[PDB]
From Swiss-Prot, chains A, B, C, D:
SUPFAM superfamilies: Actin-like ATPase domain (SSF53067). This is Actin-like protein MamK. It comes from Paramagnetospirillum magneticum (strain ATCC 700264 / AMB-1) (Magnetospirillum magneticum). The gene is mamK. The lineage of its organism: Bacteria, Pseudomonadati, Pseudomonadota, Alphaproteobacteria, Rhodospirillales. GO terms for biological process: magnetosome assembly. Gene3D superfamilies: 3.30.420.40. One of its GO terms (cellular component) is cytoplasm. InterPro entries: Actin, ATPase_NBD, MreB_MamK-like. The keyword Coiled coil does not apply. SMART domains: ACTIN. Pfam families: MreB_Mbl (PF06723).
């Protein structure tokens, strides 16, 4: 059971052979109101996004990584597993093991969290990081730089072929949520100084992801009063979003300098952008083109990362020689 | 010039020879109270704590050095410099160079910020990290794992014999602010469900820092309604703060595993704790005593870190051979 | 002036008659820390061994042979010479001549290097093979095969009747350093796979040199992690050290076969072992006893080679007239 | 079965009559990649050159001298045999005897290893030195010193008389590996002080072998930091290999002293140079020309030594009279 548990979607590819491309966020009814009819005993996935105004949303994966459960009872993770795993549970003992995607710098408490749940439910406790699944799934060679841009963290993975873990790699905290804070600051420098929330900032990032080049687009949107309506330009959206590139290429530069000549010379392994970064236009302009410029390596974007994360799930589904399971 | 940035203090050690015990927080007037340009054009220190309800508080440190400057025009930095540096400014044109403490994993954007400030004050921009600044004030031998427990980060950096700088260093995010979040989470799961804020969690941490041992103390504090007042037993304050110790000694263990036999055999040089951590009772119990226990090396607590930060400035005040200034 | 320059010690006896049993290894401070001037411009002796983690210690005697010195200024050897001059400074024209010990197969280029330095410090250059120097100090008869087992090389030299020079003498590269590599090979091919360096392997050899017989000893030492500690057996230390002697007596067999009939009948002339090999227990068992046995010649080990290196200096102080000086 | 076994490449002539110029170095997979002992039962030659970062490489012929295989099972040399010899094995018992090239000064321990391998392949163990292949294949008269300059050994052949095999000959291991050490030290004399590994040192030697004369060439490569690619000059490359020939002709001078009057009078037979050193420009300058000069003897170089190694193997293949094999 290879699951890419992330900040937006939850890509489930079982070993049995079924594909369930489910969604993120877990809530439960904020006050005492209604029975199951109104809400549900915890709400998981798309209905919690649809009812995000009626539920208390308890972070279950802070910064794209298993936290601990802030309710301090392990019920957000329990009802998460109820929705994802129990409702689609194999009825023939398809010898099921569990691989939950973790960020590149995962803690031992996140490993312990997965361990306790694997012992409770009944799954071999395996821990594989998100960019490892990509490097095992997509048939890439060493060294293929993997930049996974989600909402919570930004994983800069460029390990040697031993894949030692968090030794020669760094998980950055500046991600989509950091950009959303800068987008909130960007619209406070406008004339009417709108104060929109994070959900609105996410909508602008999703619909108008034109960061490398000044594509002439605008967000036709309403002001806080509700009657005024105008096309908000993306002049300060470009400025806000392009300020994270320096840190990405600085971490890449620092790592490449410390590697051997054959890992320095990879002007053909490219830099692979996955996640939400694959849907942002103009990220190849900085490295490949003449804009940052950052050397001259080519840049590759993953088409449909949600569908290509199940390839890594399939790769780890077989055969996983028990000897590897004891060693991981 | 040595500036020891911090939440508790922003200490200044001049070349002339004076110690200025200055304080944190920078705001500027959000309303129309007092005068802003003729009274307090930005407010720094204890007056900003005193008037924290009428000022717009735009952090500018975030547990470390230059954060980013949320004004986004060098206005938090400029009026901070006006308060601190221009008030201590030597009048005899003393060969002043700028040494400002940075976190163990400092960025190049922090260096860029230091450079922008160095152009404002025309001084040489020098970059010295805090763990080594402590080992300059307290000249201990190799190697004493200097751990700086502050409000923002927890910097764990062992020392190498040649003292090359922080090449192998750990900066954790779990710090005093993380403890305050856990303290809030603890009292939201109790009988009376206290509704205290972050500053109150910090206040109780400061007044009753008993974590290693169950010393029977109680915090005379107001209940969730606000008028009722009683001696509230600090039972779960010990529990909440206990859970950060594992990570501190895990990073040290990871270093010891990677160290060579010469560096492994250094338990007589002990581990030194500075910052707010050195004012917590029971910190030596885990490592020095027989409670975790963690090995054998003894524990030394820094008394009055403010003074020892000025010792590090004094060490770096002379002679700093221009050749060292070009090389740093 | 006789200098027995080794990897363990540097025995100095002046012409005047004073004994200075000085120490090995030359370093200098590796990164910018402290000041060599304040400490020592290059550090010579056990201070550099004790501070080998603070200093760059570039080998200045690869297997009893001076290196080319990549700095190309010969300042490792000039400060080494200075160290000895500080200990044994000449005053009233101390008829000082330089007796320098060399390995048995030293090249003319190696002698020319020593000659250049002897001309720099104005002294008569007298190149004497180390095995012959031992036979000058400990006056044995012909033919007493002298085997000098050091860290760098193993010098096997039958004493010649008139001692004409390098007629037939052998320098092997397998020595203490080779055995230390085999000790590393032992602990890396065992169950717990201990991770220890050469310095520690040398320490175990020094403290527990029990090779011919299975003396029941154990080395109380820390494991690869560094915290665990236990008494490690010397079963595979005996195996690792066993294979030195076979190669030594292989070369001696070649000498015995090459001897003329009057040199063949020399079983009462025996074989004398010096260096670090004189402090190994069970060495005489291989030859003298009935273990290999290598014939039945008796074995004599040199007691305190450090103290008996000055006896050869005294023998090569006097005499050596204007004909001996022109001859070398 | 005449096998020239080296560290760069091998040369095998079969009884059938085919030339196999196959490559050297043996590893086996250390990281998890493909199948370990099933994808390639130990990895030899060009796949180990291409995949050198995934393999554990354990040399078994340091400087033309068989080691002891530190795995302590002698499986690195046995799988090498199954790679080369078993893959080209006669299927009709083409009377096969094993002729493995040995250094001019081989030990009895090296012969013991040949005997261990001869039991694995069931063939007669024959011991013939490497430069005898050259002197018998390319029939030169007696006595024409042969200097075959390889990576590991530079066997100095001087056909002796009577006694038993090696009477007056010496293996010189001041060879490619020595030059690699000189090159690494010579590029540290540059301004930025390049710090390159052995593979790069070999690459520069192979591409621009200009030593005797100052031919102005340069190699576009990475500097010490390794950011720019610039035409790196060969000023200190000429210096690095300047002290090689002097030491070679030092040994030849010693041979000329040991030669009989008619053996000494062989300047019309010249000195024959082979191996990788035969493709270094300026080789005859030192001896034949007026640069050292070493007298005035003429110099002959072998064209394509790699292709002439099979001619020497063929010469030993036939007829190889059994009476000679019993006597060898
Ligand atoms: N078209 C788009 N342009 C920019 N960002 C997008 C787009 N679609 C989704 N995203 C962003 O992708 C982020 C989710 O991270 P992603 O890696 O795609 O999901 P997961 O973490 O589940 O694998 C969200 O911040 C979301 O706004
Ligand atoms: N007696 C005390 N017990 C516990 N913590 C204290 C005490 N006094 C001060 N502190 C804490 O020390 C912290 C300040 O440490 P400091 O090194 O200035 O932080 P930073 O350098 O990250 O800004 C604050 O969180 C403060 O509450
Ligand atoms: N008690 C001991 N047992 C075994 N070896 C020892 C002992 N004491 C010293 N040695 C070894 O003696 C060696 C020193 O030999 P030395 O003559 O100084 O070397 P070199 O001749 O190469 O200069 C070192 O390898 C050291 O470990
Ligand atoms: N054109 C060249 N110039 C100089 N050296 C070369 C050249 N080509 C190969 N070599 C060197 O020849 C050496 C190997 O020669 P070889 O006779 O195969 O030695 P071995 O038998 O010890 O492997 C290597 O060091 C290689 O770099
Ligand atoms: Mg993800
Ligand atoms: Mg601090
Ligand atoms: Mg010696
Ligand atoms: Mg060869």
């Amino acid at each position: 059971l290879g699951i890419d548990l992330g900040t937006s979607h939850t890509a489930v590819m079982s070993s049995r052979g079924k594909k369930f491309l489910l969604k993120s966020v877990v809530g439960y009814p904020k006050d005492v109101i209604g029975l199951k009819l109104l809400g549900r005993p915890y709400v998981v996935g798309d209905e919690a996004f649809e009812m995000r105004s009626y539920l208390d949303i308890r972070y279950p994966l802070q910064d794209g990584v298993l936290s601990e459960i802030s309710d301090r009872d392990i019920e957000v993770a329990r009802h998460l597993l109820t929705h994802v795993v129990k409702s689609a549970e194999p009825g023939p003992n398809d010898e099921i093991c569990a691989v939950i995607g973790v960020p590149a710098r995962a803690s031992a408490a996140n490993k312990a969290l997965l361990l306790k749940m694997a012992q409770e439910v009944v799954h071999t406790a395996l821990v594989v990081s998100e960019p490892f699944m990509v490097g095992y799934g997509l048939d890439k060679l060493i060294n293929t730089i993997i930049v996974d841009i989600g909402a919570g963290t930004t994983d800069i993975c460029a390990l040697k072929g031993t894949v030692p873990g968090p030794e020669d790699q760094v998980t950055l905290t500046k991600a989509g949520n950091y950009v959303d804070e800068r987008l909130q600051n960007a619209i406070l420098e406008r004339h009417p100084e709108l104060q929109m929330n994070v959900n609105v900032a996410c909508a602008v990032k999703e619909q108008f992801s034109f960061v490398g080049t000044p594509t002439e687009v605008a967000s036709f949107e309403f002001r806080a009063a509700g009657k005024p309506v105008r096309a908000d330009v993306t002049e300060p959206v470009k400025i806000a979003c392009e300020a994270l590139m320096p840190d990405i290429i600085e971490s890449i530069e620092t790592l490449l300098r410390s590697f051997q000549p054959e890992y320095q010379a990879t002007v053909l392994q490219n830099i692979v952008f996955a996640g939400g970064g694959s849907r942002i236009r103009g990220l190849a302009a900085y490295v490949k083109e003449k804009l940052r410029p950052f050397g001259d390596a080519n840049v590759t974007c993953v088409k449909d990362p949600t569908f290509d994360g199940c390839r890594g799930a399939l790769r780890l589904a077989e055969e996983l020689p028990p000897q590897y399971w004891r060693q991981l």
